Structure formats: C-alpha cells, structure tokens
C-alpha cells in the first residue's frame with residue numbers, strides 16, 4: 108500500500124544522454140544507435156532566437172562544428188540533418204548502451220517520466236503529464252534542453268518528448284522525437300499563447316480509485332450520476348468531458364473496487380461542488396490528475 | 412523554472428538489484444562488490460513472522476539455500492551472515508556495475524530516492540522523506556522488501572535505507588544498510604506503534620523559498636516574527652521546533668531571495684493560522700515538507 112508520483116527507473120535513458128555543443132550553445136542530446144538527437148536551437152546564438160532562420164543557420168554549420176561528448180569520450184560526427192525542430196547527428200559509433208526503443212507521440216492527458224539533464228549529465232527524474240493544452244509543468248533550467256520524456260514497457264523505452272523551451276508563463280514546451288512540437292508552439296523567443304488548459308477527468312477518477320484501494324474512502328457517497336449530468340459539472344469546473352472510452356478504460360479499477368464508474372463520478376461531482384473541507388486524499392489537498400488509469404493499475408499491481 | 416518532487420537518476424542503483432529466494436520467500440537484494448544485502452526476513456515463512464527466532468531460522472540455512480539471481484544469471488553464494496536485520500551473502504563474483512558508494516544513516520527530516528523493485532527488477536523511482544517518527548510514506552507492495560533508498564553526490568551513491576515492512580497503518584519501516592531499523596520497529600508481524608509524527612518545519616520553509624524563486628509569492632506578507640513566537644505556533648500545529656541550526660541551513664535561500672528567515676517564518680505562521688484560503692503553492696494545496704534546503708538549492712541550480 109501507499110501511492111506515490113512514481114517515475115520509471117531512468118537507467119536505460121541515462122545511458123543515452125550526451126552533451127551537444129555548437130559554437131557557444133551547449134544542450135543535451137539523446138544517442139540511440141548511431142544517431143544523436145537534440146533540439147535544433149543548439150545552432151542559435153542568443154541574438155538568433157528572436158526570429159531564427161534555422162535553414163540558413165544550419166547551412167553555416169558543418170559536421171565538425173557539432174561537438175558531441177558522452178561522459179568523457181568524444182563522438183565523431185559524420186552526418187547532420189534537420190527533421191522539423193530536431194537535429195539528427197549521425198555518429199561513426201553505435202551507442203553500446205542503446206536500449207530497445209520506440210519513438211511515440213503521446214496523447215494529451217497521458218503521463219511520462221522526464222530525465223532532467225545538464226551538460227549531458229542526469230540531475231533527476233520526475234513523473235509528469237502532458238496537459239490537455241500540450242504543455243508540461245516540468246522543472247527545467249537553462250541547459251536542460253534536450254532532456255527527454257519516456258515510458259518503459261518490459262525492456263522497451265518509448266521516447267515521447269524532448270524538451271525545447273520555457274514559455275514566459277513558466278510552463279514547458281517541447282517536441283516528439285521526430286521534432287514535431289506538441290501544441291501550437293514554435294522554437295523562437297516570442298510570447299506564445301498556451302491554450303485554455305483543463306483538468307484530466309479520467310486521471311482524477313483513476314486516482315480516486317487508487318485512494319479507495321489504499322484506504323482513503325471518506326469521499327465515497329450514497330449518490331450516483333449520469334455521463335450527461337456529470338459533464339455539466341465537469342464543464343463548470345473546467346474538467347475534460349468524460350466519454351464512454353474513458354469509462355471503458357476505468358473498467359479494471361471499477362471491477363477491482365466494485366465501485367461503478369458513475370458512482371465514482373458522483374463522488375467527484377460532490378468533491379468539485381463542496382471541495383475537500385480541509386481533508387486530504389492520498390496526501391493531497393487537491394484533485395490529482397497526473398495518474399492515468401494504466402499508471403494506477405501498474406502501481407497497485409507492481410509491474411516491473 | 413518549475414518545481415517538482417524529483418528523485419535521483421536510478422541507473423547506478425538499478426545495476427545493483429538482484430533477486431534473493433530462500434525456500435518459498437522471494438525479495439530484493441542489493442549487490443555491491445562481492446556481497447548481496449537483503450532483509451533477514453527472507454528466511455521466514457508466513458508462519459515464522461509472528462515471533463521469529465532469526466538466529467534459529469538462519470541456522471537451518473546453508474549457502475546453497477540462498478538463491479541469488481541478477482537478471483538471468485545466477486550468483487554462487489560462498490558465505491552468509493546476519494548483521495542486525497540484514498543478511499550479507501558473500502558471492503564469488505564482484506558486481507561489475509558496482510558504483511562508488513557509501514552506507515549512511517540519514518537523519519529524520521532528510522530526503523532520499525527509493526527504487527521500488529519486485530523480483531530484483533526495478534518498477535519505479537520516487538522521492539520521499541524519513542518522517543520525524545522514523546517511518547516513510549512509500550509505495551510498496553508484497554515483494555518490494557529489499558528495495559533501497561539512496562542519495563547521489565557526483566558519482567557516489569549513499570545508501571541510506573532498505574525496505575522491510577508495512578505497519579498495519581499503511582506506513583513503511585526499514586533499516587540502514589547495517590540492518591539497524593530506523594525508529595522503534597522490529598521485523599515481526601506484530602502491531603507496532605509509530606510515534607507522534609510532526610511536520611518538518613525547515614523543509615516547509617525551504618519549499619516556501621522555492622515557491623518565491625519560481626514565482627509563487629502571494630503568501631509573502633508585511634510581518635516578521637521571532638524564533639520563540641514562531642515556535643509557539645509550530646507547537647500548536649505539530650511542527651518541529653525551529654532552531655538556529657535550521658536558520659543557518661536556510662542561509663543560502665535567504666541570501667538568494669533577500670527574504671530574512673524570520674520574515675519567511677512569519678509567512679508560514681500566517682499560512683498555519685489562516686490556511687491557504689483555496690489557493691495553491693507550487694501546485695500544492697497543503698504545506699509541503701519533503702524538500703530539504705539542500706534539495707531546493709540543488710533543484711534550483713541544476714546539480715548533476
């Protein structure tokens with residue numbers, strides 16, 4: 108028992124972290140096989156970031172200008188290309204620590220672990236969710252660009268995110284491993300609107316099921332609701348509308364606890380309308396939305 | 412910017428995780444050099460745990476009874492000894508992935524990362540604090556025993572905790588790597604009182620400084636207080652009394668933000684007396700005490 112915001116073990120990803128330097132800028136790269144992936148803004152100076160012409164900036168760069176270092180050993184760059192907002196540096200050596208991996212584009216509301224790095228060295232790991240507005244509320248300082256988000260299934264690392272920038276609002280934006288930004292963001296030093304964010308309803312419900320499993324039951328009530336009625340409350344409190352797909356994904360937790368999904372929705376409706384009244388759920392005084400139904404089942408069963 | 416409950420990268424520790432089986436019981440072991448460390452209750456059956464005589468139970472065991480497996484390879488056990496509540500199994504092979512390491516006994520209020528494991532395989536990593544009452548609020552299921560807590564400085568892993576048991580209250584108890592329990596706990600299936608816990612005052616203040624650094628400033632006020640006055644409020648709200656040692660450790664954060672430690676205490680006093688009034692601090696609706704002043708400086712500076 109006990110419920111924690113758990114990240115995946117970061118070992119397989121630590122073994123891929125490298126440092127990439129181009130001119131004056133240093134950031135993190137991800138070495139998989141004979142390719143080093145990093146944000147393309149490594150080629151910019153501070154002056155360039157206001158409105159960079161990446162195609163023109165990359166044209167002035169040669170393979171020998173990209174300095175790639177894995178710990179204390181230097182990698183020889185034999186090719187360079189830009190794919191969307193990432194640079195792919197072909198190196199003459201395949202990473203011996205390359206794990207089984209995939210590049211995946213996660214859906215908003217899905218979770219992942221981030222291995223925050225500086226100068227190609229890992230500093231820490233934390234679990235986070237891709238917000239419905241395609242931002243992440245991470246912990247990243249100058250030099251953290253190129254740190255990646257991932258999930259691990261058995262022995263396969265699914266890379267889903269690469270960190271690129273901090274918006275003026277202090278929230279973070281980045282790309283999938285093909286360099287496509289999540290959301291409307293562009294890699295330029297300009298004020299950029301992150302849309303209206305919402306609370307991930309299915310994740311809050313999954314976390315209410317984790318609470319019941321772990322003993323916190325005070326919020327359970329004598330009520331039920333319908334998808335329509337619950338969604339009128341969800342709209343009022345800026346929660347994602349709940350669908351039958353969400354109900355179906357909550358099936359295993361509903362089956363394990365014996366609490367019908369619409370009964371749990373009625374509990375959530377009462378918590379939204381009355382607050383927590385100074386009480387806590389799983390050590391939190393707010394409704395947690397960074398645990399997916401799969402995360403809850405994984406943590407409550409012990410998947411390694 | 413951004414503040415997250417960050418765990419250390421777990422790679423160095425993943426490389427040490429092994430599975431230890433004795434009779435019918437399987438749990439996790441930590442392989443460092445030619446020694447495998449695991450909880451001594453691996454030698455007990457379910458019937459034994461009510462009141463085990465470990466010295467007698469271990470006497471019926473030989474080196475060949477301890478089955479140690481690192482992934483898919485079996486380790487040859489050439490020695491066995493009990494030190495307090497841990498068994499040390501000497502193996503004929505030094506772990507090639509043994510990092511630079513120390514065994515340390517942490518102080519209550521200090522933090523550490525846990526690599527939760529099952530059958531010698533890592534499932535996840537999370538940051539937690541050793542409560543003032545010497546328990547941890549972890550996330551551990553059956554099979555997690557032998558999972559360890561650690562901190563990492565540069566390249567050195569300081570192992571501070573090994574998981575042994577879950578109290579009937581759902582909180583966790585374990586030992587240092589010399590097998591000495593933190594707190595009054597014994598390794599037997601008996602109801603055991605965890606003392607009155609308190610909130611780690613210095614950590615809450617360190618986290619209030621992290622909030623100001625990251626932009627959350629609404630709680631700052633026009634007041635100040637004294638150590639004596641603040642401690643009368645701390646006693647009323649079950650907070651650890653603040654000492655000059657705590658004030659001194661907050662020196663760097665006080666210097667960075669320009670907010671005197673006693674001024675921050677006055678902010679904490681007002682938050683304790685009036686609550687958060689439905690507002691949040693760093694995404695939390697309660698006062699967070701699992702970040703030490705060193706954690707805050709490390710996260711806000713980017714130590715790798």
Ligand SMILES: C[C@@H](C(=O)Nc1cnccc1-n1cccn1)c1cccc(Cl)c1
Pocket residue numbers: 148156247248249250251252271272273274293294295296297412
């Ligand atoms: C310079 C970088 C960035 O946002 N870095 C960053 C990333 N994450 C946290 C903090 C920073 N810090 C930026 C200044 C100081 N730190 C950047 C700027 C504009 C656009 C793009 Cl794609 C990338």
Ligand SMILES: C[C@@H](C(=O)Nc1cnccc1-n1cccn1)c1cccc(Cl)c1
Pocket residue numbers: 108452460551552553554555556575576577578597598599600601
């Ligand atoms: C059996 C084990 C234990 O507490 N394991 C555990 C540890 N952590 C989480 C859950 C468990 N679960 C126990 C039953 C089901 N799970 C134990 C019992 C009595 C004393 C000692 Cl030192 C160790």
